[model samples]
Target: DRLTVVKQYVDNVLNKASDTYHGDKPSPLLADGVDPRTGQQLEWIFPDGRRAVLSNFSAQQNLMRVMSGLSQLSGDPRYQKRAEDIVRYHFQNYQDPSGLLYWGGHRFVDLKTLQPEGPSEKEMVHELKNAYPYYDLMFSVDSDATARFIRGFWNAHVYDWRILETSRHGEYGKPMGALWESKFEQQPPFFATKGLSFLNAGNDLIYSASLLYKHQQDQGALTWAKRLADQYVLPRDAKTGLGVYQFTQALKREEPTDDADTHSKFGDRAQRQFGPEFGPTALEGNMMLKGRTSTLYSENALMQLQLGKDLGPQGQDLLKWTVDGLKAFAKYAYNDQDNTFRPMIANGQDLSNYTLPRDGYYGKKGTVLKPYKAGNEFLISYARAYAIDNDPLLWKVARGIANDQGLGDIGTAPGKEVKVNMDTTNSDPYALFALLDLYHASQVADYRKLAEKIGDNIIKIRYIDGFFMASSDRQYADVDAIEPYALLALEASLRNKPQAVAPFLNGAGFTEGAYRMDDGSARVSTRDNELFLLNVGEKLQPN
Candidate 1:
């Protein structure tokens, strides 16, 4: 019934589009709190009401999600139109000379003047995670033009350098040396010496290429995927099933300390640092254990699993290995009762737990204390994993998370542990995701009720002129927040309440949408592709 509702809602959105499907045009780019009086773009409004002009890589990803979801739901061309606009806009204006995209767009003194502005800073390499969804979308849609553009840029600039395990230095240059620090600076020299950028970049490349293979049937795509997988195997032992958390073939030796050494303290010296030893640890007397705690391995495993699923018997080994690795890591890292997973735990200690305060903070190496909530993100992967293996535990865990903290609000003090409470009004995209998973899996009345309660609260507190506020403490009062709120809107839409989401659908001039201020003015424009502004009010219903 809900799927029918979704289908009907999508049909309505498709049919309702005006003649040419102009996307989000004529939308105001400046918010009310700023001086529309001066008729100039305002910079000071960034931390406040007028903040949408700033574009980031993640924004593009969000827009892609929005467009893709709408397209899949409606079978409409307009969704593709909007998605195309986003890709074109970014390629025309934001791409660097070498083809690597910059993280931010510089601000101008005034809207009309458009004089030369200072250079926008690049985000760290780890921040590159933001690009994944966009790449996924481009591959899925078989957008050859978009793929060519991205691949061109990646091949020209991103491929030349080795991707370090955690570093994000800019192109080899004076500015990079001064502005960026090696992520491994705090580690021992030997560990830092083996740093390679290609491994991480290759991971992204393989995943992206595999998607391209699915979309375009390009043998080169599969070749790249296999090559990356082969490169990855170097750090892993077949017999022991252990791998170096960080490794580089260019260095000719394994990195001494892995993430477990810094994070966990469980078993034997080599076994504790690396994962379980599946097979032999030596090849021609070469040590295989290198690298640190690897989130990439987990992510790549899922990507490979998806590839294997698509390729069937040809990819069966990769798929099996990927699933086995995921299970092993999940068993090794997860604490069921606490509902937490360590970023890295080996030899019985956790680096994230030690370095990161119980309360969350923003900085390099600070453990996100809310790993329990963060780990729930794997629900997307698990949903697919379940289809392959019919593992009831994955479904149980997903449902349990939804039943528990998924609908609650947790608070935190300056220096205290997270205080999770069911009565509070806090809402985030992460928790909302849990609710979505439950909706898809069970579709039970209780799940729907919980989702509606949270959705209603979100509309009441975070909704502003054609945009959702990032967060809210009060029931209706506006709070200081980010603009072009992508995450919240996407979460709200996925919960099947696009009608409740109508008030936040104002579009800006950009290909993706912008965030509106409390007073109903545009403040920021993100390049994210997951932007979903179409109204599907009739598709949602209360059980």
Candidate 2:
């Protein structure tokens, strides 16, 4: 099987990993990476002679997938050896047994040494999505890798006490807030709080935990999943009983509820934003819920529904969140005034505990942040609604969107209309949604030609070296580029045709990463709980 080549790759890595690869085998690589003198932690040097220093868990995880994919693909013994080395390297060094996984933001490891410095805690949540598949696959074959994986599972229990209290507003959940303290290393190995822990961050962790539950097949992971859902998932509005809660609560330490009297408390930079920064500033941080685009929310809300599909704890809660959240669409998201949809909801609901604003910028009234918008949410959510309840709501919303607004030229010039809301902060999402809309409605063969053109435009100008870019002609890639391309890839996959999307994985991509340009050292992503695939290949599905 392809597992052989994967093994071959591992052996190559294992051979190089030894200090003796430098020939002294100075330390078994187990202890070589962390040095008291050179300060340079050891690493996995790629076959191409590229060196990698795992700075944290996800980086380590990505490396694992590289080898695991090799093992699974080429069935190579060499790959397995390196997989163990990578797994052990992380288990022994990067993760502390008691780590709570917080990022203090200050650089560590002192003045500077070759030793992998700056244990910057990259967001581990998103990585879970990318790395989950690798870990699952690696565990089936590699014993040591499995050990490291299980340790994280058990350690997750340490987080049982920190759960979010729900009313706390989970968008503010995850690190769940503006500040806390670093626990990943200060404590040990790696870890959350709130028997309700990780409100905002829960997005990553919660999904992974559910996957973990599947792997472990033990109810322990299930317990964690349910706990996270209860404390952080979409909350029903007291008035509308709608599923429209903040995408995340502005979770922070205790502050005044909503009363803004003299002798203030919060708002830091945003003090001027919510009324005034001085005396009597409104204390509505966590209370002021917010939400992501309609499409993103529906994706998760549906998952919650599935999570509760078998009559689990939050069946009613999740179902209601889905139904009521959809209810929120008609009630607030769409501004019937002009047949356009509002991209985001801010300042949440008013203190009356009932009055919530549905349209526009956080403080703006009778208006929308973006004037003309694409119909992704309406089309996407309705597609989901029909899939969920077989209701006409999907087509119903679809017709309304078609009646008033339609996607405009993504390429904007003087004469074209730019649906600002359709594009991401950079430049993406419009065609992806349009393509997805076409995918949902088979009769719309009209979009196939356009989607193909969209696909062709992306294939030609959107990607470089397999790392996706924000715009077709853009250069240097950033984090935001992944989603749209991912969406592009999905549409391609659905249509059964691909070019850039299929070749997208550049497997050896993160094989060498995150170099310290100033010091001339390279540190790969650390193997925190999750291995974030900067990009992975066909064999590794990220799951």
Candidate 3:
């Protein structure tokens, strides 16, 4: 019944596609966001009053999931056919000189003028954090382009392959110099480089490369993926063996403030207050690890599970690495008494256990000893891992987390943990995912029943008119609203077709940056896909 409900929603979205684009020159492409009531496409309006239809494939990731899953369930080719068509069109038209596709958080195709556009301030760049896309369809559309794009992603983003240092942003139309050849003769050892190697960005790169090797049999891609992945692992705390959040250290500002003020303005407060040496720099040690919206473990662990599934037997090593990290975090950092986990710095110190001076970033000079409060992210990660391996330690931690979140008792009302939000919109989908994973792992019918209840709750609360709303007040049909991945995953699980469901993740958003032009005009853009600027700045102008 819910599948039927979801089918109708996708059908309505397709029917509304014509209203967004009507021309013979370029075929219709789905807009990123649509108005639920009017079936009209949404626009990203600039301060200069120029507007473009928000049509980024990165943002439409969930829609692709729904469409592909619908075809898998209903035997309807149209849903998947439309989805692939979009990919094919983009592949044919949107490649940068470096072979990377013009897709992701920062870049989009403006349907109004059929022109390429991006966040005006953060010009056209590519960033895929948790936005795990439908790569099967992508590979099916054009395998060569997909392969090239995967390689180009690494080529563009890695500022210094010799040291394995990388930047979050990449340039568009950059030359694809020696696609798969390693710049360094031997694999470089990990060091604290100037690059900001955030896990979110690296995760996308690794996933893309791994999939490239899987689909195209490119051994080089796999080797590179492993090497890049190991970069994050190499910096783990010697004592705790907990991984660092990033491979490279954030560069300090030009003018040093003081011995106490070591935090990079670009870095998070936890990184600032703790200082690089004693601060939360590693994967689980970040300040946000204990925050309500922390994705440190949740998203990455879920990605690992998906990759583990993707890689099959060969993925055992990856899974082992992931589980080992989770086990360590659960063992030392997590607090049993309060059912929470404190962040650990690179040297294995509990950040919350120590008090710091009153820095403007964290608190009033001193008394900034705030420990992290575990939330759904923490629970969902453990639950997802348990679903796969049935690891006793994982389940023990998950069970405790469930109890803390009030998921322990069956008849009691759902805990506040189940009720999460991103601004006004609720994250019921994520909750459903964690619950379904729990049911799969524990064989608990109550968990399934709870997931079903949440599914229906979402249908009632978020599903408005024909399209789902981002929130009750924000009535727009975007990626966040259009995603019913958990519901589809639930249906697949019920029918014993779990592999049919694609991974549901989120990373499709822009990374912002700004600078002044020679004319004193402020040029703002995302740290992505602007290779021409970087190339020129590097004094490598084309003849």
Best candidate, TM-score: 3
Model 1 — TM-score against the truth? 0.54
- Give the runs in model 2 whose Cα sits over 4 Å from its true position: 1-93, 99-198, 233-235, 242-299, 302-320, 336-382, 392-451, 465-467, 472-475, 478-543
TM, every model:
0.54, 0.50, 0.81
Of models 1 and 2, which has the larger lDDT? 1
Query: Quick one: RMSD of model 3?
Result: 8.0
For residue 280, what is the lDDT in candidate 3? 40
Tell me the alpha-carbon RMSD of every candidate: 13.2, 12.8, 8.0
Tens-digit per-residue lDDT, 1-543, candidate 3? 888888888887777754345555556477666666666676655445566666677767777878888888778888889888888888877877677766676677777877777664544666666666667779998998887788878888888777777766787777766656867543322344556677777888788888898798898888778777777666666777676567555554455455346445444445555555553443322333443124446666677767777788878877877777788777777776777777555455676756665363455466555556566666678777766666667766666665566445322222323332212223367667778776776565767777777677778787777777635555356643434767788888888888777766544443233433334444454232232123212421222
Candidates 1 and 3 compared by lDDT, better number: 3
Q: Arrange candidates by lDDT, highest first: which order?
A: 3, 1, 2
lDDT of 2 by residue, 1-543 (tens): 212322332343344323432344333332112221222343433234444443333323334544443443333455556556645544454433332221111111111121433342342221122222234544455544443343343344233334322221111123322111212222110011222222333444444456556565645556655655554333434454333222222322345444322111222212323334222222222222333333234445545544555446545665555655565555555554466555332323333222213321244333323533434434445544444454444444544553343343322221133232232222234444434444544434444444444444454555444333443333223222233333434444454544323222211112122333223444444321122322222111122
Tens digits of lDDT, candidate 1, 348-418: 23333434322211223444333433243454454445446656555544434433554432212111232
Q: List the lowest-lDDT window of 10 residues for candidate 2.
A: 102-111
Candidate whose lDDT is highest:
3
Every candidate's lDDT? 0.38, 0.37, 0.65
